[PDB]
Design a protein around this ligand. Structure first.
Ligand code: SF4
Lengths: 358, 760
């Protein structure tokens, strides 16, 4: 409940929507939330990069972060044991970190058989008859840290034979099939040539009289001379101007009205809220559709009931609010269209279900 | 894919073949035609193993007589597993192509540590402990007693193989180590003894260098090897080091104390058993006087303490009666140990030849060379005749006996160095004796003189003439196969100048310089901020790397690098290094930048392979010259100079460049695998040093990238990454760097392939 309340507070419009849907008894919180409902890998640089921030005013900013401590614990389980065995009783956390900095711990400055069993690589293991310490310690602890990081990354003759097969096989002298494709060859390619364009009454011309007309025009334009006066006339020019004149046939319509001032911004915002609510309700309705299981029938019936309740409890007050101002905008018409479309869809599907059963 | 290689059909298991692979096949066939040792250099990541296996299988199929059995020598167990998998794929392709399962047998050989199934021996962490436990549970004399008394210690794993595993050989095919273990569990047998039994029948046997190069372990395989057997060495650029380590002996004061304690325990046991049964000593004396051939040849199961180090001539000669008696020989060993301990009392380092030490011992302890020659024989016979189970505690005595036998017979090419003080900490009393061998060729000489042919391949083979000198032989064919790439996958750059124009160097005089360390830190920081996740840095020594890391931490530059990418630093601990590698790979595959820091001589550079997304950047901090304070290295250099006209500085440069190439050469696994190579040292600009680089790498080293700066290197890295990150199609490689069935058949392409390789 507390988490849900916080999440609703994070989205006040949804919180307002949740209120308008639940308090108005349109939908239950169970049905409301029925449809409503990061790990970081281990980096090896978490030690060298992370340093005690020595701000000039003698400031030892540790910048203690949970992720850094978790990375330390994953890489060094011993640090987790030290933390669990000391705090909060034996010592404080910051004192433990300071001790870690001062200690030498911070200031430190085979499954596969063939190519791993170095002890077994030789078949003649006879007897011995036929700052070095600092360097060895540094190497050992570096290898330990690397192994710990690699392990934290995750968090038999058959194996030997498989490893040998992987090692010996050459990609050149194998197979190169790579034919994971399916060829396609349609039946009638003429569908696209005249595609979604509907059938047009492309009438053909008459009999050889078409050829006679072609010959007539061919002879007519065979002896052609350019003309200038005949190109245009003032009367034709006047007609063209009138067609192009404001308010003319070519100038379709004209000026329009400022819709913004015709509706208050509060009414516009409430319309947005109702749009989002109805849109989500119908989205869930269409998600349930088509009803392929008997459970979906009850869910869609509940969806329709919720739509009816929301309409009655919000749009009708919204309709009255608009009507009191006598707004000429039919914003409610869009909502009515959507609601009636959904209701008719459900009624038609119920009719189909009744017909199938009978 | 079927290929025609000089009239020989090759069943390539893959649809396409690199031209370099075809050249490698042709040259390998030509080497096989001469039945002689040959050295070939092939770039890594080119699938040379597949080509080699295909050609060997083709040779065996065409003429089993010419190549009776294939021997494969490797470096690490995972290499053996990968070779087994590749050969299994090749065999499957052969069977599918031919429609029937070929009568081919492939086997992978390893130690008892990788071939034991006994539950008691499984928790053991050490191979020597494993061997001791197995021998205690698989002793030949103990076997009969267990047959007479079930509650007595035994290992049914070996018993069932002896009863049932010998009769029926394994079916033709290829088995992995895990497969061998599973089969042994199914049959209740031990895969070790079964594998050794089946070596004589296997067409291909794969194992490591030490299993055959070490004379102590030579007879465990070579006994079932004929003259026509063909051996293969892969990535054996450090074979000389392996041979020297096998033939080198180390002795310490604690070793002397343990030897004295075990010798006293042995004397007590001898007295006790003489009281219980004196006839055992008389029977042992009868065995010695009548001949050593009776005891050794009639018990092949007692190969736990085999010492085939001595030549076959020494085997015929019997132990002198002065030490044939068990008590006389125990006193002889006590005198020898006391003389050695007294000789170790010198407060300074003493360098000596084996003949001089033998002469001194003869003057002091009246010990002639002949009685000391058969020390190993008497040691083994005495150990066998006393029913000793926990031989691990008696290992120092065996080591001392082997050292004495080596000194008694092997003189030239060996040096005795006595350092009573540690090189690192001379204040600490560490009296150490080193019997160091400077002739690796002696380890490989029987291989050359016994097997039909020897094949050596490696990705880092810059000098083709030092190996015939190092190994003291004349290879039949010395051919290098250059790498041809339609798309540049490697970007080698040399940065000898830092941001402050500091001359970047890794000389130990300048290794302690703060400016060099800070410039290295800046370079690593910029590379991490620019180059993708996969970053590997090879230093010159552990101490230098640790000091540099400490300096970076104190300066704080390392902190920014950690902020950009995760860092993983290897230590001397094996488990810690394994965890570091696992975390590095996981971070690289998880999209978080991971940086690895290792040494050129460390385990990472030895047996770790980097995929395309792992080998994005490999940075070598200077030429890895080995710390010269080891007089063993100095003595080896002196011996090489006095026996092969090789300058010590030249050999040091060669070794450092070989280690650098090994560290760098493992970052590319194919044409689509592209990586970045960085060499942060001005000394790399030297023609002698730069000229000691692999041909496939040195050729691509543009002189415009010679001695760049940190910012110039960063810009070049950005350009290379953007160029090579663009999508690429294998079709572009067709006819240029990749050959199809039709493209290989082109005679012009064949001429181009012939021109690719160069014989020196
Ligand atoms: S016999 Fe085989 S299984 Fe038993 S201890 Fe020896 S190696 Fe292991």
């Amino acid at each position: 409940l507390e988490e849900k309340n916080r999440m609703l507070q994070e989205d006040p419009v949804l919180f307002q929507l949740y209120k308008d849907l639940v308090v108005s008894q349109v939908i239950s919180a169970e049905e409301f939330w029925a449809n409503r409902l990061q790990d970081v890998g281990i980096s090896a640089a978490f030690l060298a990069d992370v340093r005690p921030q020595t701000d000039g005013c003698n400031g030892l900013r540790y910048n203690l972060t949970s992720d850094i401590i978790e990375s330390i614990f994953r890489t060094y389980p011993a640090v987790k044991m030290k933390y669990a065995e000391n705090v909060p009783h034996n010592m404080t956390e910051k004192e433990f970190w300071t001790r870690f900095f001062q200690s030498h711990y911070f200031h430190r400055d085979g499954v596969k058989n063939p190519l791993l069993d170095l002890t077994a690589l030789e078949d003649k293991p006879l007897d011995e008859g036929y700052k070095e310490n600092s360097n060895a310690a540094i190497i050992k602890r570096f290898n330990h840290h690397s192994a710990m990081v690699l392990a934290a990354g995750l968090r038999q003759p058959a194996v030997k034979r498989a490893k040998l097969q992987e090692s010996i096989e050459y990609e050149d002298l194998g197979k190169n099939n790579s034919v994971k494709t399916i060829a396609l060859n349609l039946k009638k390619s003429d569908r696209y040539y005249h595609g979604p364009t509907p059938i047009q009454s492309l009438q053909y011309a008459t009999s050889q009289d078409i050829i006679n007309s072609f010959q007539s025009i061919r002879q007519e334009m065979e002896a052609y001379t350019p003309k200038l006066t005949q190109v245009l006339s003032s009367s034709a020019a006047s007609s063209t101007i009138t067609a192009l004149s404001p308010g003319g046939a070519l100038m379709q319509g004209g000026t329009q009205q400022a819709i913004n001032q015709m509706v208050p911004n509060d009414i516009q915002s409430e319309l947005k809220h109702l749009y989002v609510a109805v849109g989500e309700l119908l989205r869930h309705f269409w998600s349930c559709f088509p009803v392929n299981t008997p459970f979906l029938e009850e869910k869609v019936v509940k969806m329709k009931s919720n739509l009816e309740r929301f309409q009655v409890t919000k749009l009708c007050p919204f309709q009255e609010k608009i009507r009191r101002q006598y707004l000429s905008t039919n914003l409610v018409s869009h909502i009515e269209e959507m609601l009636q479309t959904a209701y008719n869809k459900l009624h038609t599907w119920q009719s189909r279900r009744l017909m199938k059963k009978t | 894919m079927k290929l025609n290689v000089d009239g020989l059909l090759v069943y390539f298991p893959y649809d396409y073949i690199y031209p370099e692979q075809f050249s490698y096949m042709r040259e390998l066939k030509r080497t096989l035609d001469a039945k002689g040792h040959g050295v070939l250099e092939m770039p890594s990541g080119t699938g040379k193993t597949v080509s080699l296996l295909a050609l060997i299988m083709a040779y065996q199929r065409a003429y089993p007589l010419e190549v009776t059995k294939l021997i494969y020598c490797s470096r690490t167990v995972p290499e053996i597993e990968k070779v087994i998998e590749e050969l299994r794929k090749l065999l499957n392709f052969y069977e599918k192509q031919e429609g029937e399962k070929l009568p081919f047998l492939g086997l992978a050989l390893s130690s008892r540590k990788n071939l034991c199934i006994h539950p008691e021996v499984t928790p053991l962490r050490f191979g020597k402990d494993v061997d001791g436990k197995c021998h205690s549970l698989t002793a030949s004399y103990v076997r009969a007693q267990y047959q007479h008394d079930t509650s007595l210690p035994h290992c049914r794993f070996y018993e069932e193989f002896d009863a049932h595993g010998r009769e029926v050989p394994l079916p033709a095919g290829i088995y992995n180590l895990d497969d061998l273990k599973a089969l042994g569990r199914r049959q209740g047998w031990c895969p070790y003894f079964l594998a050794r039994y089946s070596i004589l029948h296997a067409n291909v046997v794969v194992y490591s260098y030490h299993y055959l190069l070490d004379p102590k372990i030579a007879d465990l395989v070579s006994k079932e090897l004929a003259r026509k057997a063909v051996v293969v060495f892969d990535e054996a650029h450090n074979i000389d080091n392996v041979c020297i380590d096998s033939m080198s002996v180390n002795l310490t004061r604690r070793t002397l104390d343990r030897c004295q304690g075990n010798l006293e325990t042995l004397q007590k046991t001898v007295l006790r058993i003489k009281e219980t049964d004196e006839q055992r000593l008389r029977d042992e004396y009868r065995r010695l006087v009548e001949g050593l051939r009776e005891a050794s040849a009639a018990r092949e199961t007692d190969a736990h303490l085999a010492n085939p180090v001595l030549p076959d001539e020494v085997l015929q000669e019997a132990v002198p009666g002065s030490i044939r008696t068990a008590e006389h020989f125990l006193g002889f060993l006590r005198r020898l140990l006391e003389y050695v301990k007294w000789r170790l009392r010198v407060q300074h380092v003493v360098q000596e030849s084996p003949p001089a030490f033998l002469s001194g011992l003869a003057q002091r302890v009246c010990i002639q060379r002949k009685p000391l020659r058969f020390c190993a024989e008497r040691l083994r016979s005495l150990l066998h005749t006393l029913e000793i189970t926990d031989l691990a505690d008696f290992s120092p005595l065996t080591l001392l006996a082997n050292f004495a036998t080596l000194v008694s017979t092997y003189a030239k090419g060996f040096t005795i160095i006595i350092e009573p003080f540690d090189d690192r900490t001379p204040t600490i009393a560490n009296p150490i004796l080193h019997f160091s061998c400077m002739d690796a060729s002696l380890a490989i000489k029987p291989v050359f003189e016994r097997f039909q042919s020897v094949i050596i391949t490696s990705g880092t083979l810059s000098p083709l003439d030092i190996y015939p000198k190092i190994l003291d032989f004349h290879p039949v064919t010395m051919a290098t196969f250059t790498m041809t790439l339609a798309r540049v996958c490697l970007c080698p750059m040399i940065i000898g100048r830092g941001n402050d124009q500091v001359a970047i160097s890794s000389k130990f005089e300048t290794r302690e310089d703060i400016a060099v360390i800070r410039n290295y830190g800046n370079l690593l920081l910029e590379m991490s901020a620019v180059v993708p996740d996969g970053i590997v840095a090879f230093f010159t020594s552990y101490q230098y790397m640790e000091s540099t890391v400490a300096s970076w931490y104190e300066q704080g530059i390392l902190e920014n690098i950690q902020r950009n990418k995760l860092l993983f630093i290897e230590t001397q601990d094996g488990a810690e290094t394994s965890v570091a590698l696992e975390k590095y790979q996981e971070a690289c595959e998880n999209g978080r930048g991971a940086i690895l820091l290792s040494v050129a001589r460390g385990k990472v550079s030895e047996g770790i392979d980097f995929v395309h997304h792992y080998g994005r950047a490999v940075i070598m901090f200077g030429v890895p010259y080995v710390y010269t304070q080891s007089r063993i290295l100095k003595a080896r250099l002196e011996y090489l100079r006095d026996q092969f006209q090789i300058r010590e500085n030249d050999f040091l440069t060669f070794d450092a460049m070989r280690h650098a190439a090994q560290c760098v050469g493992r970052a590319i696994r194919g044409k689509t695998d592209y990586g970045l190579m960085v060499f942060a040292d001005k000394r790399f600009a030297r023609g002698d040093k730069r000229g000691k680089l692999p041909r496939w790498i040195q050729e691509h080293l543009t002189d415009a990238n010679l001695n760049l700066t940190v910012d110039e290197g960063v810009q070049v890295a950005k350009y290379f990454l953007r160029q090579m990150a663009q999508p690429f199609h294998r079709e572009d490689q067709l006819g240029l760097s990749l050959l199809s069935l039709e493209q290989l058949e082109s005679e012009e392409t064949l001429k181009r392939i012939e021109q690719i390789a160069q014989q020196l």
